[PDB]
Amino acid sequence: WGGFSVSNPTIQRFFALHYLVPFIIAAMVIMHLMALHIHGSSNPLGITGNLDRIP
Amino acid sequence: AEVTQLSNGIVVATEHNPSAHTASVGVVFGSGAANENPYNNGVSNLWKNIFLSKENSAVAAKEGLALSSNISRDFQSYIVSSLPGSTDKSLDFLNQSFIQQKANLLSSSNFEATKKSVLKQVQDFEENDHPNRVLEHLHSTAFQNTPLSLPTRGTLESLENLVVADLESFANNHFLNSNAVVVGTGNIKHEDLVNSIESKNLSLQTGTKPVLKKKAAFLGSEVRLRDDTLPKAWISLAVEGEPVNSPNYFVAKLAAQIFGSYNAFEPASRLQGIKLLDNIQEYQLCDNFNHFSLSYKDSGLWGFSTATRNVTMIDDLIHFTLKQWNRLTISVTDTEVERAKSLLKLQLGQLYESGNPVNDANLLGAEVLIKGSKLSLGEAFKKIDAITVKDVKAWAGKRLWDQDIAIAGTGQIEGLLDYMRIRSDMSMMRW
């Protein structure tokens, strides 16, 4: 809280954090895409897709 | 030089070469694999092997004669070679064995044995001759559902069902006086050849060849015959080209001479003045390539063929070669045109002056069967020397810039990209 209840210290620090977390999200999306690029995506048939691929 | 007469329904064309040591006579018909249908494909291939059967060749050998035969898409020929003093001996053999008395050749125990051997030649071709079977599938997919798509050797299913009555049907419709040219090349004289046909009363049937319904039509498509057990990748790629009698016949041949051929293992082929070699030698994209310009009666093909072992960089090989074709439309130097002029004249001069009378007979009969006469080599050199840079740009703009293509390939072709990715490379957004 920064005090005894929800007050001026709380609102001012919540805006500083609302600015920061989106840039952390952008960093975890890259880690998300890096782990996908290992084996590639899946398909609705649930079987291997190595026999037919398109760019 | 060459002389052509029409004494009757048959036409006599000659090419006297007094400084030769052999002579050849024969007959060339204006029909080929383009005058068949899917169900009798390969009949004209069976007729060639009957002419070259053991019994037929034994009679000719005892007289000092050699037999030759060739089957193309628009023509087929039957030639007899002999020494210069035995021309009338070859005309008699051709008459008594091919023009008339064709039933003894078509006898049983001779048709069966010949058919069994041709089935073996076709099976071996379809399993071992990868560069040539890819070029045959290029015709099959570029002219699908059309006369110009049938292979010149037939298929295993047409031949396996061919029967005793199928070969006699074909010769009735196509071996006629109006469809034939009698050709004499080497150490022979025009007057001596015409005076021999007029004495022996040589004559074929007096019908007329059937008229097809469809015509040749190019269609952008692709066929892929993947085979991971093969060690290489063979690919053919072409656009629609020029037929014979086209005004742009020598421009399309000069355009193919600009990129030429290449052999990675020949030291002198790596020093050629082709800018494409600068992009493909750093990482060894291919083993060999060659550019062609095929011309038929109705249409033609213009492209190239490759064989490579760099299976992971096939896209670079296709991408770089098509970007060089883009320069014909927009920016091609004067030096490139002048260099290709000198190499095309040398290439044509070798083809028409090989010194083999059998080769000249095939070229002479095929030309007369279409154009009615034959263009002189000196006249062709004048037309080649008159081509300009503006002619190349105009031709490539209408035939190459942003046009559909036909693709065929076999082997390890997993790295060959989709049609639209390759198709989009035929122009460029920068110009």
UniProtKB/Swiss-Prot annotation, chain A:
Subcellular location: Mitochondrion inner membrane
Superkingdom, taxonomy of origin: Eukaryota
Residues that coordinate or bind a ubiquinone: 37
Segments forming a coiled coil: none
Stretches in topological domain Mitochondrial matrix: 40-55
Transmembrane segments annotated in the record for this chain: 8-39
Entry binding sites for heme b b566: 32
Residues reported to bind heme b b562: 18
Family: Belongs to the cytochrome b family.
Assembly behavior: Component of the ubiquinol-cytochrome c oxidoreductase (cytochrome b-c1 complex, complex III, CIII), a multisubunit enzyme composed of 10 subunits. The complex is composed of 3 respiratory subunits cytochrome b (COB), cytochrome c1 (CYT1) and Rieske protein (RIP1), 2 core protein subunits COR1 and QCR2, and 5 low-molecular weight protein subunits QCR6, QCR7, QCR8, QCR9 and QCR10.
Additional remark text: Heme 1 (or BL or b562) is low-potential and absorbs at about 562 nm, and heme 2 (or BH or b566) is high-potential and absorbs at about 566 nm.
Known function: Component of the ubiquinol-cytochrome c oxidoreductase, a multisubunit transmembrane complex that is part of the mitochondrial electron transport chain which drives oxidative phosphorylation.
Record's protein name: Cytochrome b
Residue span relative to the full protein: 166 to 220 of 385
Curated annotation (Swiss-Prot), chain B:
Superkingdom: Eukaryota
InterPro entries assigned to the protein according to its UniProt record, in alphabetical order: Metalloenz_LuxS/M16, MPP/UQCRC_Complex, Pept_M16_N, Peptidase_M16_C
Database matches in Pfam families: Peptidase_M16, Peptidase_M16_C
Membrane topology, record value: Peripheral membrane protein
Record GO biological process: aerobic respiration; cellular respiration; mitochondrial electron transport, ubiquinol to cytochrome c; protein processing involved in protein targeting to mitochondrion; proton transmembrane transport
Sample GO molecular function, one term: metalloendopeptidase activity
A single Gene Ontology CC term: mitochondrion
Signal peptide residues on this chain, from the entry's feature table: none
Alphabetical keyword list: Electron transport, Membrane, Mitochondrion, Mitochondrion inner membrane, Respiratory chain, Transit peptide, Transport
Subcellular location: Mitochondrion inner membrane
Family the entry assigns: Belongs to the peptidase M16 family. UQCRC1/QCR1 subfamily.
Note: Present with 19300 molecules/cell in log phase SD medium.
Annotated PANTHER family: CYTOCHROME B-C1 COMPLEX SUBUNIT 1, MITOCHONDRIAL, METALLOPROTEASE
Record's subunit section: Component of the ubiquinol-cytochrome c oxidoreductase (cytochrome b-c1 complex, complex III, CIII), a multisubunit enzyme composed of 10 subunits. The complex is composed of 3 respiratory subunits cytochrome b (COB), cytochrome c1 (CYT1) and Rieske protein (RIP1), 2 core protein subunits COR1 and QCR2, and 5 low-molecular weight protein subunits QCR6, QCR7, QCR8, QCR9 and QCR10.
Primary role: Component of the ubiquinol-cytochrome c oxidoreductase, a multisubunit transmembrane complex that is part of the mitochondrial electron transport chain which drives oxidative phosphorylation.
Protein name as catalogued: Cytochrome b-c1 complex subunit 1, mitochondrial
Organism, as annotated: Saccharomyces cerevisiae (strain ATCC 204508 / S288c) (Baker's yeast)
